């Protein structure tokens, strides 16, 4: 069904697929095995649809959180890296590709939100959320604002809500306890209350979303935003003299962003599983292999320790990994779906004054 004795690789069209194809050329130069890289349209739904019929690529690249359900459906093979190879990648990235106790993909890249700041407006950005009100009053006297970021998605607001103790599901030793939910605990209430107080005191506007915040920062109107490495290209085009740093702390504790891990899974239907392992372990997950992909399209931070140490000479990448290591892996379990939609309503309701903080988080835990 899938052709034996070659490799077909699918990766999304926003990634460095030409660099990946070049790694495949090097593999062919050593082994005679042809490696074909594709970036099919509608890849997110195409892979599960085609793989469910026993067809498709040998290797699929996607964010780890979707791979949990692919493994549940029997679409991904368990991978078999030795201890020596596992030691080459950060331990938390292996946790992101663990499902039902089995490793089901190779971690490649790591992304998380960071604090992005305008160096001309704010050379020394605040280390704490608690400083933002006074900083905003200063900047508003100069026709600016301190901070604008997407308040509409819990992906952006949860890092502050998690700082003092909020969480979706308790995660200990690679397993989630879906009976242990921290959406309305004291820490979540503390963080959401600080957020709503920022709005109450006119330091943020409850309507600010992704597009409003991005325009305001790239036009030099606000001193800070919160966003991920996918947004850096637009800020480059704007020529804003920006930096990227650790998220502000809340009550002395780090903001805890969700972490996404671009990962490479092996199709359960592939008759080339050992070839795929050899390509991924010995060619792609090397300094030379990740460099080829990164030179085509930057990966951001990476799961390979050796190459991350090189990339982290860029303080933006060092900040990305620092924030990711202070954050939480995005859960790959289906129970996480209800979290996004419930907390989205809760924050909207608290920020607009339709519910109190305690009422909103109570309904969200409910």
């Amino acid at each position, epitope marked *: 069904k899938i052709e034996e004795g070659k490799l077909v690789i699918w990766i999304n069209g926003d990634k460095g697929y030409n660099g990946l194809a070049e790694v495949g050329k090097k593999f062919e130069k050593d082994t005679g095995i042809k490696v074909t890289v594709e970036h099919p*349209d509608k890849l997110e739904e195409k892979f599960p649809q085609v793989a469910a019929t026993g067809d498709g690529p040998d290797i699929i690249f996607w964010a780890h959180d979707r791979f949990g359900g692919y493994a549940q459906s029997g679409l991904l093979a368990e991978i078999t890296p030795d201890k020596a190879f596992q030691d080459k990648l950060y331990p938390f990235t292996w946790d992101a590709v663990r499902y039902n106790g089995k490793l089901i993909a190779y971690p490649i890249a790591v992304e998380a939100l960071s604090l992005i700041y305008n160096k001309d407006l704010l050379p020394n950005p605040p280390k704490t959320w608690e400083e933002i009100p006074a900083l905003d009053k200063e900047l508003k006297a100069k026709g600016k604002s301190a901070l604008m970021f997407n308040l509409q998605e819990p992906y952006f607001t949860w890092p502050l809500i998690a700082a003092d103790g909020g969480y979706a599901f308790k995660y200990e030793n690679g397993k989630y306890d879906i009976k242990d939910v921290g959406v309305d605990n004291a820490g979540a209430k503390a963080g959401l209350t600080f957020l709503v107080d920022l709005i109450k005191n006119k330091h943020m506007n409850a*309507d600010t979303d992704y597009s409003i915040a991005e325009a305001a920062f790239n036009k030099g109107e606000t001193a800070m935003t919160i966003n991920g490495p996918w947004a850096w290209s637009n800020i480059d085009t704007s020529k804003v003299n920006y930096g990227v740093t650790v998220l502000p702390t809340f009550k002395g504790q780090p903001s805890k962003p969700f972490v996404g891990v671009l990962s490479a899974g092996i199709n359960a239907a592939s008759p080339n599983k050992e070839l795929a392992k050899e390509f991924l372990e010995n060619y792609l997950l090397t300094d030379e292999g990740l460099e080829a992909v990164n030179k085509d399209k930057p990966l951001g931070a990476v799961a390979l320790k050796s190459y991350e140490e090189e990339l982290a000479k860029d303080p933006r990448i060092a900040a990305t990994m620092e924030n990711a290591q202070k954050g939480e892996i995005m859960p790959n379990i289906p129970q996480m779906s209800a979290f*996004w939609y419930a907390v989205r309503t809760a924050v909207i309701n608290a920020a607009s004054g339709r519910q109190t903080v305690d009422e909103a988080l109570k309904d969200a835990q409910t």
Partner: nanobody
């Protein structure tokens, strides 16, 4: 199969200055769709965003080249999102796609944000 299905209709040919309405029927488990987008792609060109509707805020965003000419709207009862295209220009010729997402971390104005995609409907404008 996909948990959400999107079906575009309404494509056609219009002389420059005229109008045309597209529709996109959404079906399946659509309870948590927070974002509906219209995109277009002509041969030899990158796919580009046309209009984005944020269902839970009502905010609508338009490409600079179509702002003031196109209108995106949602009929929640019919689970159908529309693209009303007024004052059409030859540069609007393309295959038009609707797309949907429950949530996302990236920009709702970009194609990479959207999980579900329709088959596309052809719009041709002549000068």
């Amino acid at each position: 199969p996909s948990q959400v299905q999107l079906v575009e209709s309404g494509g056609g040919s219009v002389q420059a200055g005229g109008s045309l309405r597209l529709s996109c029927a959404a079906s399946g488990q659509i309870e948590h769709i927070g974002y509906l987008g219209w995109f277009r792609q002509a041969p030899g060109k990158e796919r580009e965003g046309v209009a984005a509707l944020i269902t839970y805020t009502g905010h609508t965003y338009y490409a600079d080249s179509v702002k003031g000419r196109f209108t995106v709207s949602l009929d929640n009862a019919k689970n159908t999102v529309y693209l009303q295209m007024n004052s059409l220009k030859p540069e609007d010729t393309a295959l038009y796609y609707c797309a949907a997402a429950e949530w996302g971390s990236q920009s709702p104005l970009t194609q990479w944000f959207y999980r579900y995609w329709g088959q596309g409907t052809q719009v041709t404008v002549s000068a």
